[PDB]
Write an enzyme that holds these catalytic residues in place. Structure first.
Site, PDB file in Angstrom:
ATOM      1  N   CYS A  88       0.823  -1.208   0.000  1.00 15.56           N
ATOM      2  CA  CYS A  88       0.000   0.000   0.000  1.00 15.56           C
ATOM      3  C   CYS A  88       0.858   1.258   0.000  1.00 15.56           C
ATOM      4  CB  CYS A  88      -1.424  -0.013   0.669  1.00 15.56           C
ATOM      5  SG  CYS A  88      -1.899   1.146   2.011  1.00 15.56           S
ATOM      6  N   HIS A 131      -2.905  -6.156   0.456  1.00 23.06           N
ATOM      7  CA  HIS A 131      -2.259  -6.588   1.694  1.00 23.06           C
ATOM      8  C   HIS A 131      -2.069  -8.081   1.835  1.00 23.06           C
ATOM      9  CE1 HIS A 131      -2.488  -2.750   3.796  1.00 23.06           C
ATOM     10  NE2 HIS A 131      -3.557  -2.559   3.025  1.00 23.06           N
ATOM     11  N   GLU A 150      -0.251  -9.734   3.470  1.00 21.94           N
ATOM     12  CA  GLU A 150      -0.252 -10.093   4.880  1.00 21.94           C
ATOM     13  C   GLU A 150      -1.583 -10.666   5.329  1.00 21.94           C
ATOM     14  OE1 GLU A 150      -0.358  -7.081   3.799  1.00 21.94           O
ATOM     15  OE2 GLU A 150      -0.927  -5.551   5.333  1.00 21.94           O
TER      16      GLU A 150
END
Ligand SMILES: Nc1ccn([C@@H]2O[C@H](COP(=O)(O)OP(=O)(O)OP(=O)(O)O)[C@@H](O)[C@H]2O)c(=O)n1
Ligand SMILES: Nc1ccn([C@@H]2O[C@H](COP(=O)(O)OP(=O)(O)OP(=O)(O)O)[C@@H](O)[C@H]2O)c(=O)n1
Ligand SMILES: Nc1ccn([C@@H]2O[C@H](COP(=O)(O)OP(=O)(O)OP(=O)(O)O)[C@@H](O)[C@H]2O)c(=O)n1
Ligand SMILES: Nc1ncnc2c1ncn2[C@@H]1O[C@H](COP(=O)(O)OP(=O)(O)O)[C@@H](O)[C@H]1O
Ligand SMILES: Nc1ncnc2c1ncn2[C@@H]1O[C@H](COP(=O)(O)OP(=O)(O)O)[C@@H](O)[C@H]1O
Ligand SMILES: Nc1ncnc2c1ncn2[C@@H]1O[C@H](COP(=O)(O)OP(=O)(O)O)[C@@H](O)[C@H]1O
Ligand SMILES: [Mg+2]
Ligand SMILES: [Mg+2]
Ligand SMILES: [Mg+2]
Lengths: 536, 536, 534
Positions: free
Chosen positions: A379, A506, A508
């Site tokens: 991001c 993301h 993650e």
């Protein structure tokens, strides 16, 4: 099939690990082939976490469905394969707000709308909704038993228990069992007082998860069992461990799963628990270790980056590398200079919002880029890169993002609508949740992900200004991934750099200890290589 | 000048008379020349009472400012001359909803919004706002101490007390002191348990208002005083009385006012209390008595008509007439017929909403009209009349109100927008609060009100169809009052009837025991005359 | 046969009528041929209730076994045929005393004695000790739930319920549901808060007994039922009645017994309230009315004379007479004079202790004897009589009891040790049930219809056997004797309409269902006189 509910509460203190303990339990029930799920009830008034500052409660988990939620949902996803949905999280705010509109438009037919039952009812509705088609639902009640903000939640659940009946409901309560250095002993008293608290609201715990520094001697466990009118077996010790991946194991080790299956009259074949063992093992048997710099802005609160940390961790696992995360505040970068970026094997630039530090970040990207340091940007981490590159490579002088300088000559980063030229020419917003993404042939990521298309999660407005693209591409930068529509740029890579990747979504939010994640795995292998070669 | 607050709470049970006791207190402080006010805090979720069904919590008081509120505000206005405003009433709903928007638009800057302090703070803000420029503010906390719906209110006020300091704050708690027929004694225990309840939340009562069948013997008062750590003087007995107008007197009789002035260090000259005495007196010394029929729809719950009843009562006072209110459900009218309207000295048709009974009402108007029975119609009470008249006099066959038959040939009653002809021709909404009104020369009301213009309170949408007016006027009906603008019709009168009046606004919301009200006074005198002449 | 326990608790206020409620409930279960019992636990420190005054807590009931107990035991005995023992009533004071004692003689082994478990155990012990050999036990916890006074009791039972299991434990909680005149509605709130109080201590009621002046509407009931998580069937309405004897009826009428029976998995034949029915019937259908005068001291606490009153009430059932009891203070007799005795169809002088108005009583005794007014004197009431007679008849100048005038000269009443004559010549406290020998031609022999009887004592001062023959000679009848030292238990006055006086307390044996010879006869007399006198 009949649904079962495990109500999870905590007493004495907050920061007890209720989220984790539930996931761990889920994991162990998953492992016994059960259809399981978890849900978190938040006593706060914010309608949703979309508003909270990462530094308040931590990061904003984003689910597939684009919901902004409590980080606990992450924990949830990293312990069970079920995917979280808006259905798995809710706050008093959301609750109230629904009721208010209902009322405001008269769904209650001039009835006096009250806490009980109106509000309770609303809570119950949502819980059932979350339960919907599952063998077992773990319902995490946020907050501490005894405060008032959770009274309704509790009352609500108490009701459910009565209705559903105890053949399909349980009360699992986490409590603190402090260690008295002087007396040289652990104290149940707190547990005592807490349990009394439950009772006082109509609730009698079914199981007790005793948190503490060390293990909870059978002695005290018995003491507890006895005064809580709980079967000794139902009294579990949950000490502090060096790795949460072990938690599941302790629970099992204490036949919690069993206890659970029996109480619920479920068919639970014996499990293996090999996946958790394997994780633990990998974890403990590293080959190399590296240092990864995580340069950001909200570093005062590590939880602000829960998922990212974890993802890095998984990276290490998959590579038998021990990752040492050096937390770095961008401020200090622009402040003290690159000097600090000295001694890193790789660099990560996570997402965020501000401008507060942006500069530092940029500088950093630059640093990693110039110095051939494996770099990973997410991001904000991606923009900062675009920027660095455009500025110092495309020579877009003061390139930027309309988020930080709405009138730059070169708004490389900007909302679609804002999209313009360096001249001023035009062209004849919040991205949330899971999004398909097409990978570019001949791209690192296409290799890593090993597939033409993938799906990652978004949480952003600002996009890469397609108008200034070709220019930057021409300068050397490479577009590795795009999003159908306005074929919006999602991933970029630096061509002839050891490992330089940046993306919008993301990753993650998709990584796990068990199955890791490509990018991080790669990111990680890269960092190792660097360190190894930094003396090869 | 420093503001003082009297927090009023109740324990044991609801329906304790907390609203009245506060007004009574206010009255007595008013009488000592103090700048006083009262405010009611409602634990319910409805944003406002505008939604509740009269049968749930009673009538919707309407303040000058057009707010829809708890009926307690009426009590407030009938005991003190201060006028109530939106500021004097609020619900959890309102509270939450404000906070939610604030948050929703980010006024909390990504902070976690919590019960404490966010919510409490909001409560406090409103309380101060209500206090604003007054010597004494009485804050009525709705609900029963010990339930959860009022916890925040309580916490909130507890905080205030701490901040403001006890030199400007007091805790007045109403409690039940039941009488044990068997033991032949009154019980404090409940009071005991309740007080413990307060304590348990950080609150220590300053005064105890003991409710009961009878008086509370000094004996028990002492008992109470002692265990509540309250000065005997602070323990007041508030038995059931035959007239609430006496309440003020008991308080005084027990030097509550004094106690109050001293605690607050105020200059309170000795009072007279003559106005209350006078009321009481008038009340007890009637000359004639009459029976007034109140024909409506929500009669199952008398409180649905609080103000109206009272207004009638005041009527009696001003005329030394004893009014006997015969409650009549319209249903039974259309059902059993006019037969029931037999034995009435006058008739009142209050407001409402439905159609549920409308017919009956109409029939009734008709009855009262035809049989020369003093008639008084409010809101719905007015339409029903228009109707009766148009139907059976103007011969508008099936005249009606678009509220009940949106396609009548003759929509005598209708929203402005709807306004049409008997043919279908047109012309090239919620009225709330205080409105000026111009009286018509040569009209009963112009006489009664004794003034060209007046101000009454509204709470309605449907208006008198100006289009079908002239027609009805021509039939005989008379317009006694109008509202500037679209000179909307507000009052009508039947020309050559003993006493036949009907109006849009709610006179009742303006009447008081002390100063009565013209219409009711007149309405009343009329009814007497009728009865007297029904044997003259 | 596994013993079951019904814990009886009360909330909101004291004086709810737990004692009766429990008794009535037992009455029914007994009626299902159930081996039932009841016990009472007092949160009070007084070790023995035998110390506290009546102006304090009412009469001191005496059990067969001689235990001095709380009046509730009287209630118990008048509802169930089981007999109370010391083991059916205990105070906090007794518990501690035991523990303390038991502690000081190292029973604890240098261990720290604590509220929990030590105290709680002590209690549990007694509870079981008391439920020894019954299918159903009713444990009434004194005090109001929420008060600190009874936490230990509460905790003790919670424990038991647990150890024992819900299959043999129930929680019956009495509550207050007031009626709000303005609102015109009964309130459940207090109940609500009350139950919370219970929950707060780990107890979850099983049954709710709603006390009110009026019956509890199903609507409200249903409410309660909900919020307390008890079957509607478990929420009993128990309004204020004009006679406690209807209680059982009420209860059964609501199916309580069935509930219990089912809950306890007990076989219980259909109930038989025929006798309760009779009693109610008799009570409601008196064919005559009399006014009986009860002259004593503590009349400022009717409860001081409970058992007596009832016995009267019961004599009337048997005679179908309506008894008007006139509470009179002996002092006022001394003071105001025999005028007060004006208009009474009979006179009853109850026992008591303290010189206070003994003389007033003597006058009263005289009056009755002299004016031929049916007389019943119990305990002190008997003495007063002896005295009266001795003097006013045996010319035993200033006759008396060494309890009030030790230098008597004429200690016609005094401890045995104290026995002495007028010239001065010569040659502890009795409690519980004791055989009494009835004099053959005595009226009392007649009523009782048996040579021997058993009655309960609670006294020290005895008839001076020394001065006996004397009074005996003046024309006094010795209707009943003890044993060995053939102590005087009863005396009858010759040819008076109905003159009887006794040492023991017959009232402790009377019963609504079975009445009592003396009382019945007494009352019978009251009538005849009332009648004659007109
Ligand atoms: N509701 C309760 C429960 C227990 N106790 C008292 O608690 C004491 C024992 O507590 P303490 O010695 O402080 O330790 P534990 O209860 O064993 O708990 P811990 O050692 O974990 O603090 C006992 O004397 C018991 O009387 C009490 O007063 N009230
Ligand atoms: N927090 C408290 C307060 C009082 N008590 C006990 O309360 C008893 C007296 O109460 P009760 O006789 O029931 O009546 P009162 O308290 O006087 O109240 P009332 O008559 O109004 O019901 C005392 O023995 C005292 O030990 C208690 O256990 N816990
Ligand atoms: N533990 C509880 C239970 C109920 N409530 C609130 O209780 C109110 C209803 O109580 P009320 O109207 O005062 O009377 P009831 O409880 O219905 O019973 P009663 O009228 O017989 O006292 C509702 O607003 C509900 O939100 C509460 O705050 N806390
Ligand atoms: N058994 C444990 N050993 C070590 N750390 C733990 C353990 N359980 C929880 N934690 C940590 O404690 C914190 C609380 O976790 P969480 O489950 O989110 O708490 P809460 O109870 O507030 O939901 C986290 O930082 C987590 O990493
Ligand atoms: N002292 C009193 N004597 C008689 N009626 C009373 C008395 N106080 C209150 N009331 C009545 O009791 C009810 C409760 O009044 P209110 O003050 O509105 O109660 P709450 O405590 O619910 O606000 C009303 O119907 C009122 O008329
Ligand atoms: N249903 C009832 N109707 C009338 N009086 C009752 C009722 N239940 C109990 N009582 C009376 O009320 C008083 C309460 O006595 P008791 O039963 O001992 O109450 P507690 O034991 O709960 O203090 C007694 O005078 C008793 O006779
Ligand atoms: Mg959590
Ligand atoms: Mg009120
Ligand atoms: Mg009792």
């Amino acid at each position: 099939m009949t649904t079962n509910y495990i109500f999870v509460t905590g007493g004495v203190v907050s920061s007890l690990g209720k989220g984790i303990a539930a996931a761990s339990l889920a994991a162990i029930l998953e492992a016994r082939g059960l259809n399981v799920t978890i849900m978190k009830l938040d006593p706060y008034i914010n309608v949703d976490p979309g508003t909270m500052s990462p530094i308040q409660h931590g990061e904003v988990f984003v689910t597939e469905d684009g919901a902004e939620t409590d980080l606990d949902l992450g924990h949830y996803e990293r312990f069970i394969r079920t995917k979280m949905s808006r259905r798995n999280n809710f706050t008093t705010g959301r609750i109230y707000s629904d009721v208010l509109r209902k009322e405001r438009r008269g769904d209650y037919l001039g009835a006096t709308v009250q806490v009980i039952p109106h509000i309770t009812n609303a809570i119950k509705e949502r819980v059932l909704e979350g339960g919907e088609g599952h063998d077992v639902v773990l319902v995490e009640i946020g907050g501490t038993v005894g405060d008032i903000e959770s009274l309704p939640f509790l009352e609500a659940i108490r009701q459910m228990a009565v209705e559903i009946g105890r053949e399909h409901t349980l009360f699992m309560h986490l409590t603190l069992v402090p260690y008295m250095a002087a007396s040289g002993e652990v104290k149940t008293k707190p547990t005592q007082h807490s349990v009394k608290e439950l009772l006082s609201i109509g609730i009698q715990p079914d199981i007790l998860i005793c948190r503490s520094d060390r293990a909870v001697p059978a002695n005290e466990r018995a003491k507890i069992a006895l005064f809580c009118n709980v079967p000794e077996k139902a009294v579990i010790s949950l000490k502090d461990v060096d790795s949460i991946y072990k938690i599941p194991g302790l629970l099992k080790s204490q036949g919690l799963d069993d206890y659970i299956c029996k109480r619920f009259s479920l068919n639970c074949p014996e499990a293996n628990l090999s996946e958790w063992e394997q994780v633990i093992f990998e974890e403990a048997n590293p080959v190399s270790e590296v240092t990864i710099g995580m340069v950001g802005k909200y570093i005062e609160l590590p939880d602000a980056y829960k998922s990212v940390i974890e993802a890095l961790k998984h990276g290490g696992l998959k590579n038998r590398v021990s990752v040492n995360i050096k937390l770095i505040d961008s401020q200090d970068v622009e402040t003290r200079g690159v000097e600090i970026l000295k001694g890193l094997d790789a660099i990560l630039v996570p997402g965020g919002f501000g401008y507060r530090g942006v500069e530092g970040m940029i500088t950093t990207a630059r640093f990693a880029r110039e110095n051939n340091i494996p770099y990973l940007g997410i991001c904000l981490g991606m923009q900062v890169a675009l920027i660095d590159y455009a500025r110092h490579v495309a020579n877009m002088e003061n390139a930027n993002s309309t988020e930080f300088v709405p009138d730059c000559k070169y708004p490389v980063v900007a909302l679609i609508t804002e999209w313009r030229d360096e001249n001023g020419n035009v062209e004849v917003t919040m991205r949330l949740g899971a999004q398909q993404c097409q990978l570019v042939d001949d791209s690192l990521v296409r290799q890593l992900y090993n597939a033409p298309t993938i799906v990652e999660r978004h949480r952003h407005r600002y996009e890469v200004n397609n108008m200034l693209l070709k220019q930057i591409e021409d300068a050397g930068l490479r577009v590795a991934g795009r999003s159908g529509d306005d074929q919006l740029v999602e991933i970029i890579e630096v061509p002839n750099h050891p490992w330089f990747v940046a993306c919008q979504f993301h990753p993650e939010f998709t990584s796990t200890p068990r199955d890791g994640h490509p990018l991080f795995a790669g990111f990680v292998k890269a960092a190792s290589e660097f360190q190894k070669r930094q003396a090869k």
